[PDB]
């Protein structure tokens, strides 16, 4: 089974909704990935920041192994002995009254939208089905019809049919626009990434998140922080909103909540919001199952025990300082926080970000462009300074190779 | 670590979106569950048919244990060695050109709606954005904003903001209604469960599915079969539509696709539909990851080698025959196919379905009511005839003790 055999088999039998970088991995550990021919690569994508803990982290693997012989799925029609322990752990970790467990990032987002509308109708007092949710241009929170209904990316929404009403879009990093939107008392929530990941690591100006908090509070609007990609130590803090000391009304976690071992996502908020949803009014077959819950407890413990936020902070400072040494008639922008970083590749009609990632792959480093000309650099947070130095050398010699 | 500790902790720190049967499980094996006090129960819900293969089936556990050590998540920005093997396997198993992997059943349904809309615009010629999707009253396909927009159950949609446009609703088990609805040329698809599960195991009349297939073809409308619950041997066939030899345009699979070990779903269809979605136009972080694909291959293999379809066919006949022996004063209807079955209870001031289910629990059998008065009986398909008779005697004991 060769890489080309793998490419062709997927092309024949799988949908073509992805165009992946041509590399075929069969193993991963820590910061490293191996393809089927045995070549080794630095992972600088981390599955979009889902493997913050590194691939196949042994403590998470052992949690999964311990629970899978015991009990894996009851559905929430019954109780089991694991879900409560996890719920107590994660609500006490992030200091919210309650958690609503789901599986994928987009499901946590859908759940937040449902809580915001329910809260708007039953607490704020909006007349039924006039509630609005505001989003920021550039946002990505998944691919359901609701989620693409808030997207400004034509590839997400075009051809996918009438869109969800009550979803309004304002520019990112634009407080007066948010103030203007929040003039309308029918607005129930503003959902926003503290740093926009799929948009290309778009870091807003300092004080943006503080102003969001103050505007949402002043207008009695729920502040929903999507931290599915920025949370869990990726940017150098437990939540990226910790950089500004801001407390969202709802927090979304996913991705790294499981170390990549299991689709686990979380909706955290206080009772005044969460309990707007009554028994039978929301759910998911796999949401809150014992296996994902054991995996999630272990994944969070790893983030804490190994001090991965502080490592991400220090190493991100180093990586950004080395990337800013790149020439600028080639790299026109370097941005990021912690180990969520990007560069912007001045795309001639001679070379582009894709060619850059193909040559990075040839030199043993795996990264993928987004929105054409942006290259994200987002390695697992267990990377060491010497490993980061070697990877930076790969990046330098590749960029300069063009 | 008692049952009441468990109830109390979940009340404190978990969302209140379920009201579960008060039983606190900590182990499952095959058809059996054990609670934290050591009490043993027959599982007659099967996590809504996600554990068709029984709890903790060893072949699926070993598949998961074999992969969790190598590679669990690259995202589909890269290729991995497992996904294409699984795609070849499942597509040849069900005789469709391609599969689009997702994680949860609602995500497969959303994916199908997006396929149907995009096919309507790009193949059928419907003007953007006028494409409709027809659904049957009583349908249940998850809890996203889209899915509840097509629901006729007030508990799923009431209070949940404005609804998704372009969905029409007709009665179930009603070919003339479908015929009338498909006069509109802007209809792209009809999505329907071969047997409505959450609605209370509502079995359509013989020939309904043949007539659906005929009307969809006659009017150039996609037939989407949601077999997330009815598929994978549950009703005594690989797909419930196999009872009438009908081939939907799109098939949804979920739940038992992983034996309960991992959230895996799938959307199956031929090229002329599947390839209306181009690269970058749809995906999911965890969709198609190698861990889920290894468990899904093993879960399917279990269903084939242990002959669970024939088992559920024969044993479901035995179960329905014995449930029809119950008194028409208390049990007013019996229905089902294979091991997907339910009874309807005559509600009086001396018993209701919740009371019956609490007493079933006290007698060693776990079931949950749906829509008030319907009890579903759905044990794992690995159950044996003598175990099924023991369970039936627990049901007789319970019903006749009222
Ligand atoms: C994921 C993403 C989601 C959707 O999560 P899901 O894929 O488990 O449904 C929601 N919120 C955020 C902030 C993120 O990041 C990815 C973002 C994309 C990227 O290129 O960064 C691709 C996604 N799968
Ligand atoms: C036919 C069908 N289609 C889609 C979904 C959504 O799947 P999901 O929960 O997102 O994985 C389900 C799940 C159901 C049904 C159910 C009950 O009471 O029967 C409780 C669930 N959570 C389903 O049965």
Author numbering:
A (entry chain B), B (entry chain A): 38 to 439
Show the paper's wording:
The acquired crystals diffracted to a resolution of 1.91 Å. The most well refined molecular model had three monomers in an asymmetric unit in the C121 space group. The biological assembly of hOAT is a homodimer. It should also be noted that the carboxylate group forms salt bridges with Arg413 and hydrogen bonds with Gln266 rather than interacting with Arg180 or Tyr55. In the case of noncovalent inhibition by 5, the ligand is located 2.8 Å away from Lys292, resulting in the additional translational freedom for the carboxylate group to anchor with Arg413. The unique binding orientation of 5 also led to a water-mediated hydrogen bond interaction between the imine group of the ligand and Tyr55 residue.
Human ornithine δ-aminotransferase (hOAT; EC2.6.1.13), which belongs to the same evolutionary subgroup as GABA-AT, converts L-ornithine (L-Orn) into L-glutamate-γ-semialdehyde (L-GSA) while also producing L-Glu from α-KG. Aminotransferases are members of the pyridoxal 5′-phosphate (PLP)-dependent class of enzymes.
